[PDB]
């Protein structure tokens, strides 16, 4: 069996490498430094902090909020296992880092900054984070009542709500602040019902599923953290505008939970909150189709056992769906026979990410892991070139790469930003999955681990 403690410890550490702004003194690596300290200067605000999205240095607040919410979800479900591993403190520190940044992006009730950095310009430069802000300006982008962005504002509300949920027992003052910001951002999103202003992320993180599942997503997290039934009532109200499986009348089920489509996770949380069969059927339709099949149709699988939804961030999809299987299979209302099927599914997907096919797909872990992730700072080029140096100067511990194709084929290639891609959302659900696997199978993390 694989060391799920070591994997978990590193999958969490991966986020330290993504940090932007003035780093705290408690960081565990010696190669990341302060960066992009002027973020927000163009609008008179302190918009520093947060995570760089992927191997670039743009801060995209839609996938960032998604990542924070999933990280908080891991704590919510597997707090005790995360403490026993000794990594709960690090994971909590990262959640607050992202949420602190979301709060700074919300200086007024109906003004939310959703992006720092221009996508096209930032991607022209292959330079480390500590040098990026000298090469090109980093403008701030915002939405308001006249140019609204309901998807991203609702997504950030979910993140702050989930943050308040896990910080309420340790820092109630901080939890109260996050809740206040979440309900404001929720009201902002619900009032505008539009993405007319969400324009800086076009061609990078444009959603087509709609902001309504983001509303149910946020409404459930607000209720779990605050108990205000008003936001549970609003969550169930917008279920009828979730995506529907084509050629049917079911709630969509043949995709997966991801930064673009959160109605999957929303259905799981609403099932646990309300115990209604509407949500239980929807999530069980999804997890059934992803395992044994539903109505004679089944998600594609590679011969080596990987659930292969699509070629873009395939492992992000498998590990994330696997995490949902963990949470639901551990639920008391889950049919027992379906529980064993779902959890065996989760272990196989986890083991595939860790090296069941013959090689780890987690940088710096296991056998023959990827060594050339499409990541500017870990590569650390001295001349604006992906090819120079020919080896990464730094190890991007814990990063889950895009993954192999449908025939289990994969090759290291710093230039392939699909197969060798890494990103915040790729590791989000992965943490939750490993937390469960550690709880069940153990495997001790590296003591005193430093990068």
Ligand X SMILES: OC[C@H]1O[C@@H](O[C@H]2[C@H](O)[C@@H](O)[C@H](O)O[C@@H]2CO)[C@H](O)[C@@H](O)[C@@H]1O
92 three-class SS: helix
Residue 51 in the binding site for ligand X (CB under 6 A): no
Query: CB count, 10 Å around CB of 271?
Result: 23
Least distance CB 208 / Ca ion (angstroms) = 8
Find the part of the chain contacting ligand X (CB under 6 A) among 49-57, 75-83, 323-331, 345-353.
49-57
- Considering beta carbons, is residue 54 or 346 the nearer one to ligand X? 54
Binding ligand X (rule: CB under 6 A), the pick from 76, 110, 204, 331 is: 204
Residue 380 in the binding site for ligand X (CB under 6 A): no
Residue 260 in the binding site for ligand X (CB under 6 A): no
Residue 55 in the binding site for ligand X (CB under 6 A): yes
CA distance 287 to 302: 17
Give the CA dihedral 197, 234, 222, 147, nearest 10 degrees: 10
CA distance 445 to 451: 14
CA distance 180 to 36: 28
Answer with the entry of Ca ion, ligand X, none that 209 interacts with (C-beta below 5 to 8 A by kind): Ca ion
Residue 425 in the binding site for ligand X (CB under 6 A): no
Least distance CB 379 / ligand X (angstroms) = 11
Query: Do 121 and 164 contact (CB within 8 A), yes or no?
Result: no
Least distance CB 306 / ligand X (angstroms) = 22
Least distance CB 15 / ligand X (angstroms) = 16
- Interface of this chain with ligand X, residues 135 to 154, rule: CB under 6 A: none
- Considering beta carbons, is residue 126 or 438 the nearer one to ligand X? 126
Binding ligand X (rule: CB under 6 A), the pick from 56, 100, 284, 288 is: 56
Answer with the entry of ligand X, Ca ion, none that 213 interacts with (C-beta below 5 to 8 A by kind): Ca ion
Positive/negative CA dihedral, 113, 119, 120, 126: positive
Query: Do 289 and 283 contact (CB within 8 A), yes or no?
Result: no
Find the part of the chain contacting ligand X (CB under 6 A) among 48-56, 275-283, 402-410, 441-449.
48-56
- Interface of this chain with ligand X, residues 209 to 228, rule: CB under 6 A: none
Residue 163 region, left (φ>0) first, then alpha (ψ -120 to 50), else beta? alpha
# of chain residues touching ligand X (CB under 6 A): 7
Find the part of the chain contacting ligand X (CB under 6 A) among 19-27, 53-61, 139-147, 350-358.
53-61
DSSP assignment of 155-220 equals HHHHHHHHHHHHHTTT-HHHHHHHHHHHHHHHHHHHHH---TT--TTTTTS--SS-SHHHHHHHHH
Residue 128 in the binding site for ligand X (CB under 6 A): no
- Peptide linkage before 357 cis (omega within 30 of 0): no
What is the edge-to-edge ordering of all strands in the sheet holding 59-60? 59-60, 111-116, 140-144
Positive/negative CA dihedral, 14, 414, 1, 344: positive
- Considering beta carbons, is residue 56 or 288 the nearer one to ligand X? 56
Which residues neighbour 421 within 8 Å (Cβ) at sequence distance 6 or greater? 54, 55, 313, 373, 374, 401, 402
- Considering beta carbons, is residue 58 or 160 the nearer one to ligand X? 58
CA angle 396, 402, 403 (to 5 degrees): 110
Residue 123 in the binding site for ligand X (CB under 6 A): yes
Binding mask 400-419 for ligand X (x = CB under 6 A): -----------------x--
Name beta bridge partners: 411.
none
Residue 66 in the binding site for ligand X (CB under 6 A): no
Find the part of the chain contacting ligand X (CB under 6 A) among 14-22, 54-62, 82-90, 233-241.
54-62
Tokens at 385, concatenated: 């070139």
In the complex, which residues of this chain contact Ca ion (CB under 5 A)? Answer: 209, 213
Closest residue by beta carbon to ligand X: 56
Find the part of the chain contacting ligand X (CB under 6 A) among 29-37, 50-58, 170-178, 222-230.
50-58
Binding site for ligand X (CB under 6 A): 54-56, 123, 204, 417, 421
């Amino acid at each position: 069996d694989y060391n799920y403690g070591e994997a978990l410890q590193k999958a969490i550490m991966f986020y330290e490498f993504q940090m932007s702004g003035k780093l705290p003194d408690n960081i565990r690596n010696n190669w990341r430094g302060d960066s992009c300290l002027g973020d927000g200067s163009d609008v008179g605000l302190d918009l520093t902090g947060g995570w760089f999205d992927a191997g670039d240095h743009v801060k995209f607040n839609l996938p960032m909020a998604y990542t924070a919410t999933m990280l908080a979800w891991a704590v919510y479900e597997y707090k005790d296992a995360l403490q026993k591993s000794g990594q709960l403190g690090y994971l909590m520190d990262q959640i607050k880092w992202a949420s602190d940044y979301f709060i700074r992006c919300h200086p007024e009730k109906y003004v939310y900054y959703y992006q720092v950095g221009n996508g096209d310009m930032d991607h022209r430069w292959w330079v480390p984070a500590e040098c990026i802000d000298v090469q090109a300006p980093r403008p701030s982008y915002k939405v308001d009542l006249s140019n609204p962005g309901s998807t991203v504002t609702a997504g950030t509300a979910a993140a702050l709500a989930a943050t308040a949920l896990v910080f309420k027992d340790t820092d109630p003052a901080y939890a109260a602040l996050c809740i206040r910001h979440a309900k404001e951002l929720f009201d902002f999103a619900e009032t505008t019902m539009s993405d007319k202003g969400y324009t800086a992320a076009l061609n990078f993180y444009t959603s087509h599923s709609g902001w309504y599942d983001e509303l149910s997503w946020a409404g459930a997290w607000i209720y779990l953290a605050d108990g205000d039934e008003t936001y549970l009532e609003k969550a169930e109200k917008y279920v009828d505008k979730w995506p529907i499986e084509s050629q049917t009348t079911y709630i969509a089920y043949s995709w997966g939970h991801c930064w673009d489509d959160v109605h999957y996770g929303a259905a799981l949380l609403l099932a646990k909150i309300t115990n209604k069969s509407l949500y239980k059927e929807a999530i069980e339709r999804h997890l059934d189709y992803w395992t044994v099949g539903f109505n004679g149709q089944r998600v594609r699988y590679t011969p080596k056992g990987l659930a292969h939804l699509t070629d873009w961030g395939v492992l992000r999809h498998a590990t994330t769906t696997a995490f949902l299987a963990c949470v639901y299979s551990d639920w008391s209302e889950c049919p027992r026979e379906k529980a064993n099927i779902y959890i065996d599914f989760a272990k196989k997907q986890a083991d595939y990410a860790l090296g069941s096919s013959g090689r780890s797909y987690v940088v710096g872990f296991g056998v023959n892991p990827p060594q050339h992730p499409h990541h500017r700072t870990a590569h650390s080029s001295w001349c604006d070139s992906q090819k120079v140096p020919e080896y990464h100067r730094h190890v991007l511990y814990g990063a889950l790469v895009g993954g192999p194709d449908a025939s289990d084929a994969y090759v290291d290639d710093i230039g392939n930003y699909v197969t060798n891609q890494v990103a915040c959302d790729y590791n989000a659900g992965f943490v939750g999955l490993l937390a469960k696997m550690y709880e069940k199978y153990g495997g001790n993390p590296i003591p005193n681990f430093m990068a």
